[PDB]
Write a protein that binds this DNA or RNA. Structure first.
Length: 77
DNA sequence: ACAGGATGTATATATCTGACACGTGCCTGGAGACTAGGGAGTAATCCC
C-alpha cells in the first residue's frame, strides 16, 4: 500500500491527500512503518483528546484546495 | 385475518472515548519563642 502511494505519488507527481484507516491498536506500528520506508514525505496521526483533535485538525484540515495542499502534512493516519 | 419480513431482545464478548479521579514539585503563610506596652479586669465610689 505504501508502494502504491509512493509510485502514484512521485512517478505521476501527485503526492496526494493520503488517508489510511485501520483498527486503533496497529497504528503505532503503522507509524513505525511510515517512519522506516517513507519519512521522505511526511505523516500526521491522531490519538488523544477531543481538544487535541480540534487543535490538530487546524494544522490538518486541507488548508489549500488547489495543488494537493503544498503541504508540510499529507498523510492522515 | 394470517403470513412475511422488518425491527427488537437476549447472553456473551470485544474496542475506544469521556469525564471524572488521584499524584507530585514547591512557595509562602502559619507556628514558635519572646518582650513589653497597654487595654482590660476589678475593687471602689458618686449619685442618676
Amino acid at each position: 500500500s505504501i508502494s502504491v502511494m509512493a509510485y502514484l505519488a512521485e512517478r505521476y507527481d501527485i503526492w496526494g491527500p493520503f488517508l489510511v484507516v485501520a483498527p486503533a491498536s496497529t497504528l503505532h506500528n503503522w507509524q513505525q512503518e511510515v517512519s522506516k520506508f517513507v519519512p521522505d514525505f511526511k505523516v500526521l496521526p491522531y490519538w488523544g483528546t477531543a481538544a487535541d483533535r480540534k487543535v490538530l485538525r487546524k494544522f490538518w484540515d486541507r488548508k489549500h484546495t488547489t495543488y494537493k495542499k503544498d503541504s508540510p502534512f499529507h498523510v492522515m493516519i
